[PDB]
A and B are shown apart, each in its own frame.
Chain A
C-alpha cells in the first residue's frame, strides 16, 4: 500500500543505441558502451541482412 507510481518499461533507462543490443544485462558496462559506440560506425553493404 505504500507504492505511489511504477515504471512503464524495463528499457526506459537506456538510450536507443544501448537498447539495440541483445542480452545487455549479461555484459559489462564498459563493453556495453564500446558496443554501442562501434555499432554506429558500420558502413552499409551491397545487400542488407
Chain B
C-alpha cells in the first residue's frame, strides 16, 4: 500500500520509445522491410477453421 503505480507505468511506457529513437543510428540507416508474403503455408496436421 502506498505505491505510486501511475508514475511507474508512465515511465515504463515512455522509456522504450525514447531509447529506441536514440538508438537508431547503430544499424547505419539501413531499411527495415520484410517481403510481403503471397500465400498461406500450414505447418502442422489438423483441421482448418474459417471465421
What is A's interface to B at a CB cutoff of 8 Å?
Answer: 28-30
User: For the complex, what is the distance from the CA of A28 to the CA of B29, rounded to whole Å?
Assistant: 10
Could you list which residues of chain B lie within 8 angstroms of chain A, going by C-beta atoms? 25, 28-29
For chain A, what secondary structure do more than half of its interface residues adopt (helix, strand, loop), or is it mixed? helix
6 nearest interchain CB pairs? Answer: A28-B28, A30-B25, A30-B28, A29-B28, A29-B29, A30-B29
B28 neighbours in A (Cβ, 8 Å)? 28-30
Docked pose: A30 CA to B25 CA in angstroms: 8
Assembly CA distance A2 to B25 (angstroms): 40
CB of B43 to closest CB in A, whole Å = 38
Q: Closest Cβ of chain A: how far from B5's Cβ, in Å?
A: 40
